[PDB]
């Protein structure tokens, strides 16, 4: 099944915009689809630049990162690790 995890954005989705950019590279290195979602219910598809811009406004908001695939855990863990600094 799919694997997601709620992560609170403390006015910093992580190390600058590297996380978002790195995600694109991770999706290629890992086998699984990663998707981001804001508490507002806005699906910030990690495969869309427009979505990344919307997440930027999520400074202090909660989001729900979802990952599907064999390595879905790695992708999600990698993103969570980056968001946690």
Curated annotation (Swiss-Prot):
Q: Where in the cell is it found?
A: Cytoplasm
Per the record, GO CC terms? cytoplasm
Which GO biological-process labels does this protein carry? phosphoenolpyruvate-dependent sugar phosphotransferase system
**What keywords appear on the UniProt entry?**
Cytoplasm, Phosphotransferase system
Every copy of the HPr domain together lies at 2-85
Annotated active site residues, numbered on this chain, are: 16 (pros-phosphohistidine intermediate)
This protein's major location comes to: cytoplasm
Kindly indicate whether the keyword Cytoplasm belongs to this entry. Answer: yes
What InterPro entries does the entry give? HPr, HPr-like, HPr-like_sf, PTS_HPr_His_P_site, PTS_HPr_Ser_P_site
**What role does it play?**
Component of the phosphoenolpyruvate-dependent nitrogen-metabolic phosphotransferase system (nitrogen-metabolic PTS), that seems to be involved in regulating nitrogen metabolism. The phosphoryl group from phosphoenolpyruvate (PEP) is transferred to the phosphoryl carrier protein NPr by enzyme I-Ntr. Phospho-NPr then transfers it to EIIA-Ntr. Could function in the transcriptional regulation of sigma-54 dependent operons in conjunction with the NPr (PtsO) and EIIA-Ntr (PtsN) proteins.
Give the family this protein belongs to, as stated in its UniProt record. Answer: Belongs to the HPr family.
- The entry's protein name is Phosphocarrier protein NPr
Q: What is the originating organism of this protein?
A: Escherichia coli O157:H7
């Amino acid at each position: 099944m799919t694997v997601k995890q709620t992560v609170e954005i403390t006015n910093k989705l992580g190390m600058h915009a590297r996380p978002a950019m790195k995600l694109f590279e991770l999706m290629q290195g890992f086998d699984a689809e990663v998707l981001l979602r804001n508490d507002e219910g806005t699906e910030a598809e990690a495969n869309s630049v427009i979505a990344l811009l919307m997440l930027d406004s999520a400074k202090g908001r909660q989001i729900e990162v979802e990952a599907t695939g064999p390595q879905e855990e790695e992708a999600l863990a990698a993103v969570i690790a980056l968001f946690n600094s």
